[PDB]
Subunit: 63 residues, 3 copies
């Protein structure tokens, strides 16, 4: 049903957010090994991560 | 409602696309510092990015 | 319609999964060039990738 398909879409989105955070973590480990000017990059990652987190928790409450 | 949940799912997808582009940018900065054979990788990233962009703009028009 | 918007959301999710796998591949190529302790990272990437894959194939069957 429409409701079931919707819950599955959210679950996929939550699963991809996990993968996305794993790639962010990985990239940071790589940079650390060495641009030094990652300040803005970090800010953007943090802002969008917080954003995604709030949209997800919202969708979870909309289920 | 079904309509509200749907708009929120799209918003999460748009937010994750932003994060995804940030990780792509980051990876490129890392490679640049140094496989040289990233030609295909770049092509694939570009094709899927353009693809995702068109699906999003489409969903936005389907709202 | 609700059904069309839903199919488009899934398509965007499938397209982003492709991009996500491309960034994972890229990160691995970068690490390979050099933390050595990526064991857990690999396990997590694999578990969530398999997970995302099953949710997608499921959604495809829910269409």
């Amino acid at each position: 049903g429409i409701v079931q398909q919707q819950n599955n879409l959210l679950r996929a989105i939550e699963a991809q957010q996990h993968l996305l955070q794993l790639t962010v973590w990985g990239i940071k480990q790589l940079q650390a090994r060495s641009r030094g000017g990652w300040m803005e990059w970090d800010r953007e990652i943090n802002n969008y991560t917080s954003l995604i987190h709030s949209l997800i928790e919202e969708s979870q409450n909309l289920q």
